[PDB]
Structure formats: C-alpha cells, structure tokens
C-alpha cells in the first residue's frame, strides 16, 4: 500500500553492514561459551533474508522469524534492565554490572545495536545511499520491525524484579508510544514478573523535584497494576554517583 520510491529521508545502510554483523556474531560467541553452537554465517544469511529484495516499508515480524530461531538465547529472567530514551546510561550500567542484560547485551540486540539497514523492491541490492525514517517515510521498515520483534520476546523472558531506566528530563518521562511503552511493558508476564521498578534519571536542574508522582509515571503504574504486577519508582538524582555506587552490589 506504501508508495514506490527510490530515495528515503533516513541514513543509508551502515558501511560494511554484512562484515560488521558477522564480526559482532563471532565476537559475541567468543565472550559467551553458552552460544558457541551458533553458526554466524547462517545468522547473517537469515538476517539478510529478512529484508533483501523487499520494499523497506512492507517488512513484517514473520520476515525476521528465521533470524529469531537461529538467535534463540536463554537470558536470566531476573537480571533484565529495560530502558526508554536513555540507552547511554543503561549500557554504562550493564558494562559495570556484567551479570545484568539490556536487549543490546543479547546476541541479536548486540548484532543490530547502532546499525541501519534496508533493501530495495525487485533487486538483490542493499541500499547504502538511504533507508526509511520511521517518522518521515514509514513505520514498518527493516530496523523498526526488527527492534519490535526482538523487544517483545525479551520482555516476555523477564521475571522477578524488572528494572526500567527512564529519562526524567524529557517532557514525557514515560512515553506510551515509545518501544518500551507500546511493546515491552505490555509483554511483561504476570506472576512470572513480581515488580517493575522504574529508575527516573534526573538532569541538571537546580529545583530538583520528586519525579515519581509525574502523570506519565502514574500512567505506567496503572498499565502494570492492570497486569497484576507491583510498581516501584526510584528518583536517581545523581546518575554519575549511581554509576560509581552500582559497582558494590
């Protein structure tokens, strides 16, 4: 239904995308002995097969099913850090706390982190010139559909206390139309998950106020309360101090 077009608003496929995905797969399987059964060439073939020779506004979650089977990974359900609009500090945290996982510390998340990719209708060519922007061109693009599909499975995997980092400086601390807000929160399984604990990260403001009563936090509390999951909210006033303190536990 999307209009045929050859130029997009977004950045092109990242330079050396095929080589980068293969190298990242090799590196991840070296770090994680429990994933050395993975054939990284086969993973790349499944990844390429998801988006090559398709109009990059007509991508479906089913297109990624071969990649999702090969990238199947058991991740410790009680050691998950979700995040929304604060990837920088979330990744700093799991670099310190190496027994904790964000989505981008899993094989598939690690492969795709900070990369862009798309193909072209009626050719076998990866488009290095431009790729669809989610806002300016179309929602159902290779990158957006990939992150939706892996994020749902990651959220489904969570148990016990799930932590989520949020940016307290933003106009919407919790945005319901974010990936966290529209996919991840709605796939936290009741009973399996005991509690969602929000960590609200503060910015530079001098008039530092309790952000855990913000209407968007009440919105998040309401969503997870209706899933029969307990809600907790923590103000993180000094994220620099938090990241130094986090080393102990």
């Amino acid at each position: 239904h999307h209009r045929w077009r050859q130029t997009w608003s977004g950045p092109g496929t990242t330079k050396r995308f095929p080589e980068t995905v293969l190298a990242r797969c090799v590196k991840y399987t070296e770090i994680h002995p429990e994933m050395r059964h993975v054939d990284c060439q086969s993973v790349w073939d499944a990844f390429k097969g998801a988006f090559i020779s398709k109009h990059p506004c007509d991508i479906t979650e089913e297109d990624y099913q071969p990649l999702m089977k090969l990238g199947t990974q058991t991740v410790p359900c009680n050691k998950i850090l979700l995040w929304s609009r604060i990837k920088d500090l979330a990744h700093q945290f799991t670099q310190v706390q190496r027994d904790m996982f964000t989505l981008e510390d899993t094989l598939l998340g690690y492969l795709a982190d900070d990369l862009t990719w798309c193909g072209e209708f009626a050719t076998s060519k990866i488009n290095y010139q431009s790729c669809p922007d989610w806002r300016k061109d179309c929602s159902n693009n290779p990158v957006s559909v990939f992150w939706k599909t892996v994020s749902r499975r990651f959220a489904e995997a969570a148990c016990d206390v799930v932590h989520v980092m949020l940016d307290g400086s933003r106009s919407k601390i919790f945005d319901k139309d974010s990936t966290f807000g529209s996919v991840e929160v709605h796939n936290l399984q009741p009973e399996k998950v005991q509690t969602l604990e929000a960590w609200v990260i503060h910015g530079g403001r001098e008039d530092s106020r309790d952000l855990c009563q913000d209407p968007t936090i009440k919105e998040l509390e309401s969503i997870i309360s209706k899933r029969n999951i307990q809600f907790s909210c923590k103000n993180i006033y000094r994220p620099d101090k938090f990241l130094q303190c986090v080393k102990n536990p």
Partner: antibody
Amino acid sequence: QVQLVQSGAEVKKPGSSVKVSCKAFGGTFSSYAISWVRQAPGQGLEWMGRIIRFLGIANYAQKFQGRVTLIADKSTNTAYMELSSLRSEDTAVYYCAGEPGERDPDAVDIWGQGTMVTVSS
Amino acid sequence: DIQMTQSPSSLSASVGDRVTITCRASQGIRSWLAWYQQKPEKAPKSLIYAASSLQSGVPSRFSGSGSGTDFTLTISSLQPEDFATYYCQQYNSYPLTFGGGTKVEIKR
C-alpha cells in the same frame, strides 16, 4: 545426546585436596552456569556452589567458602571443582550439573554421572 | 537458609495409582522450585523447573503445582520406572537448598 562426563573415583587422606573434572560431550552445551552438588552415602543432596561460564564468577554455600574453588576456563571445554583440607565427612559422590540460564540462579536440567570421593586415614 | 520439608518421607504405591508428594519452603520462593528423580547407585534426573514446567523428554504423566511456600509433584498413573526417590530444590535465593526426599516404593 549432550552429556556431562566427570573424572573417576578418588581416595584421599585427610588434609589433602581433590580436583574433579566436568566436560560436555555429544551435542550443544548451552548451559549458562555449572552447579556442584554432593551426596554423602545414604544421605540427601547438598548444593556446594556454581560458576557463570561467560563471567567466571562463582557463588558458594557458606560451609564451602574458602575450601572450594570452581573453574570454567572460557578457552577450554572442561570445568573443575577443587575441594581442599579434606575431612572424613567430605566422603560423598560429587555431581556437576548444567543450568540452562532461564534465571540466575536456575534449576539444573543436566547432571554428570558423579565422582565418588572417599576421605579416610 | 530456606528449609525445604518433603512429606511423606516414604510412600507405598502400586502401578496405575495416582501419586501426589509435597514440598514446603520455610519462606516464599515464588515458583523457583525444581523436582529431581534418583534411583539407587545412579545420578539424579531433572523432572520439573519453575514449579510446573516439565524438562524435555519427561513423560506427560508428571505434573507440578505450587506458588509461594507449598508445592506438589503428581504422577497421574504410576509406571514401574517411576519407583524412585524424588527431591525438591528451591533456587529462589542462596544457599540453594534441597528437601530430604520422598521414596516411592512398591506396595505389597
């Protein structure tokens, strides 16, 4: 078809140390952690400790802290349990076991065949 | 430590019987309870994880139930290969602790 295979039976004097090996054979070994459990003759199962394979960080039961070392070198396919300062009451079958990693810690889904360790003068 | 208490210590039963054995934790362990089977002079075999989930290859006649403190393993129709000792284990928190076991023996 994957199985955990341990070293054979050991007979040790009090005060000595024993090193028991645990190696995966015959299939995909996707265990997140290796766990160690012992069973004294005619008694129940007792957890000793565990090690996360990708990190090499171990959790120990208080009664084995300072007596037990777990190894799972990332550059080889063999895990080890070394128990030092052996006492007669350490006489037991020692089991290694694999945690799939659905949780940290997790239930074990695979057991080694066991290693009988006799400690006696 | 979380003390795990299994009951009964021994159970006399016949082939075809419905058998239910129980495991109680001294504290809440959510659903983080495993069941293992052991036969004389052999390693344990994994049956159940997360209170109710069967390990791969475990016959459908095995089931598990429980959340919090009180847990159940049920064999719907006992087979000759099911006469054995059964152990529960909490893996909620450290140290990981085992029940004292339930021997399922042949009634005569």
